Amino acid sequence: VEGLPPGSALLVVKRGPNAGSRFLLDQAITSAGRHPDSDIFLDDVTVSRRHAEFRLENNEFNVVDVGSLNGTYVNREPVDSAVLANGDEVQIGKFRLVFLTGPKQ
Numbered sequence: 096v097e098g099l100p101p102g103s104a105l106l107v108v109k110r111g112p113n114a115g116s117r118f119l120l121d122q123a124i125t126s127a128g129r130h131p132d133s134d135i136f137l138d139d140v141t142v143s144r145r146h147a148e149f150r151l152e153n154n155e156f157n158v159v160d161v162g163s164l165n166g167t168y169v170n171r172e173p174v175d176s177a178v179l180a181n182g183d184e185v186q187i188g189k190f191r192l193v194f195l196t197g198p199k200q
Contacts, residue, residue: 099197104156104179106149111190112139120156125149127187128163141165141188149179156194158185 096105103121108114118125118135127135128146137146143163150157159176160167168186169177177183179194186192 096195096197101198102151102154102200103197104149105195105197106135106185106192107195109184109191109193111137111188113137113190120149120151123151137187137190139188139190142190143188146187147185154200155179156196158194163187 099105099119100121103119105117105119107117125134126145126148127133127137128144129138129142130144145161146163147167148159148161150159156179157176158167158169158179160174165188166173170184181194181196183194184191185194
């Protein structure tokens with residue numbers, strides 16, 4: 096995705112309550128959950144208060160499950176963590192997201 100701040104990435108909701116919504120990943124830790132102060136607020140009972148984190152580490156974005164009830168899935172597989180690649184699908188509750196790489200630093 097050319098039109099993003101250098102070093103950032105984007106998560107797009109492909110399916111779910113807010114299909115079309117998208118969220119910038121441009122910080123060391125981006126929280127995703129039903130907690131009201133989540134950086135990515137996914138307000139559905141299928142989503143844990145603190146469900147996952149998108150972490151920027153060694154110039155790579157990783158998704159980390161932080162003890163969700165239903166799990167965090169990357170390409171349909173539940174993971175404790177995964178280094179994300181362009182086009183990877185991430186499922187958090189009933190939200191189906193795709194991870195898109197942005198421009199380099």
